[PDB]
Structure 1
Amino acid sequence: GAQDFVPHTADLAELAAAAGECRGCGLYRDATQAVFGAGGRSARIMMIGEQPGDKEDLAGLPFVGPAGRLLDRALEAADIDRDALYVTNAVKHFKFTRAAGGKRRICKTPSRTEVVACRPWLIAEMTSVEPDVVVLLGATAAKALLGNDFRVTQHRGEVLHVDDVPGDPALVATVHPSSLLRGPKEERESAFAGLVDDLRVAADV
């Protein structure tokens, strides 16, 4: 996968530039650019989404669109400062299609193959940042570190620890913020509160 493209450095700027030249799977072709993680190596909390979406692919930054604004609202309710986080995604190139009459590029799910191909960047990020806790936002991120059979819905609120993860950080798997954007008002509000709960669990680690 991406392993030959990952240089022997923990400097995030060098890692990010190297990711721009990655060909570890096919996703680099149609994306605009790689979207590396944002934040600094002093971060105690790392958060991992699925992939850059439409806005991120062009902004060059993770979580800048509607799922990002909802995450900001949850972080602020959890009194977590986003500037103090390291925020990234399991795959670094936007996988997408267009529908006729659609108003945006639509994200397509990364295959497990692509996730495994890109995981070396995630490993380099964790080795570089040495977070105390990793928040996994959604199924793809959670499976990247916890195994392909892992179910986010069955482990809400739980602090996890697995053996093949750099520095043995605490892991907290939670709902993807994109899932909180749609549905009945009451279901959204209860899901938002659970997101805030899971963020508080990670920060109290």
Structure 2
Amino acid sequence: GSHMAGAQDFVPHTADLAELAAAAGECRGCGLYRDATQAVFGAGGRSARIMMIGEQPGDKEDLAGLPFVGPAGRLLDRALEAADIDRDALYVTNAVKHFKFTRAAGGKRRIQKTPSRTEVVACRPWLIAEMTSVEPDVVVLLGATAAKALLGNDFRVTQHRGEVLHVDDVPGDPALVATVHPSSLLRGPKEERESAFAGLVDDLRVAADVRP
């Protein structure tokens, strides 16, 4: 009803990641396909047991067609290295698959703008498809958007950071760990950003030890 179908019309009944990624290029589940160059689907293979979910592609992601290749990806890799996790053993994706940005004169263009909850819920069927395909043991939710995508619109990362949680409406019942988004660490107060980074590394280590 006045709740949207969003991407559900566009998701094929398949577990194959190539078929899903190509189908996502055709998605018109929300408005974000219009400004964006292409859909940015996940990176990695179905053999991964840990899935990590960011917010949305940024500028270089939208051009490259792959997640976490810009500055946020550098910070993500710093954290993964500190947590002794191999990025190529992960399945990395985003809550929203099309880059949302403004082109408005005169400000910085091609910088991320906040996805609407409408858009996140519209795009969530792709996440469900990816979780059905990869069958992760653990899903790390990087930041508020991704966390709310699976844990609900009233979810606060600051109240549950690093806890190992479960929800009732996701296929296969992976453990969920909500944590800091690496992009949040690019700028901000020094002490809090470094405490947040250490907490991210802790949460990543926790996620790597969990088998529900």
In the superposition, the TM-score normalised over structure 2's length comes to: 0.94
Shift in Å, 1:187: 2.4
Q: Tell me how far 1:104 sits from its aligned partner.
A: 4.7
Q: 1:183: how far off?
A: 2.0
1:21-76 deviation digits (Å, cap 9, x = unpaired):
11111110110000000100010000001100111000100001111100000001
Pairwise CA distance, 1:184: 3.0
| Greater mean alpha carbon deviation, residues 182-191 or residues 159-168 | 182-191
Query: Cα RMSD between the aligned structures?
Result: 1.1
Verify the 8 A CA contact 1:47 1:135 in the aligned structure 2.
yes
Shift of 1:181: 1.2
- Partner residue of 1:194? 199
Q: Secondary structure at the match of 1:107?
A: coil
Partners of 1:54 and 1:104 within 8 A in 2: no
Partner of 1:170: 175
Q: Which moved more, 1:120-129 or 1:90-99?
A: 90-99
**2:34 pairs with 1:40:** no
Q: What is the count of residue pairs matched by the alignment? A: 205
* Aligned-partner SS, 1:87: strand
CA contact (8 A) 2:180 2:197 kept: no
Secondary structure of the residue aligned to 1:96 is coil
Q: 1:102 aligns with which of 107, 122, 142?
A: 107
1:88-147: CA deviation from partner (whole Å, max 9, x where unpaired): 001100010135465551211111111111101000000000000000001110001000
Asked if the contact 1:90/1:144 (under 8 Å) is kept, the reply is: yes
Tell which deviates more after alignment, 186-195 or 66-75.
186-195
What is the CA distance between 1:182 and its match in structure 2?
1.1
* Aligned residue number for residue 120 of structure 1: 125
How far did residue 189 of structure 1 move?
1.8
Q: Equivalents in 2 of 1:173, 1:203: separation in Å?
A: 13
Unaligned runs of 5+ in 1: none
Contact kept in structure 2, 1:49 and 1:88, CA below 8 Å: yes
Residue 3 of structure 2 is matched in structure 1 by none
Task: Give the fraction of aligned pairs with identical amino acids, expressed as a percent.
Answer: 100
Whole-angstrom distance in 2 between the partners of 1:80 and 1:102:
37
> Which ranges in structure 2 are unaligned for 5 or more consecutive residues?
1-5
Match of 1:62 in 2: 67
SS in structure 2 at match of 1:106: coil
Could you state the TM-score of these two structures normalised by the residue count of structure 1? 0.97
